[PDB]
């Protein structure tokens, strides 16, 4: 298909989100991420692995 399939308005394929804030206690390592889902683009969390 040629039309109404792909964006072609200069958007990314992968996004790397640095944690907004994080704490490293002796037991664990908790990080908070603020992922923003564009304005029209949509994802499924089969992706979004933690690095």
């Amino acid at each position: 298909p040629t039309h109404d399939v792909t964006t072609e308005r200069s958007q990314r394929l992968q996004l790397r989100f640095v944690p907004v804030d994080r704490e490293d206690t002796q037991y664990s390592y908790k990080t908070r991420f603020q992922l923003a889902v564009g304005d029209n683009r949509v994802l499924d969390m089969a992706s979004t692995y933690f690095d």
């Binding site: 298909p1 039309h3 109404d4 399939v5």
Partner: peptide, 24 residues
């Protein structure tokens, strides 16, 4: 939305639920 599907040619080519749950 048939135009969105990949076309086999002149005619576009064309299982919407999942059933996978079991304890063994």
């Amino acid at each position: 939305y048939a135009a969105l599907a990949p076309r086999q040619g002149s005619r576009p080519m064309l299982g919407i639920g999942t059933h996978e749950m079991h304890g063994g």
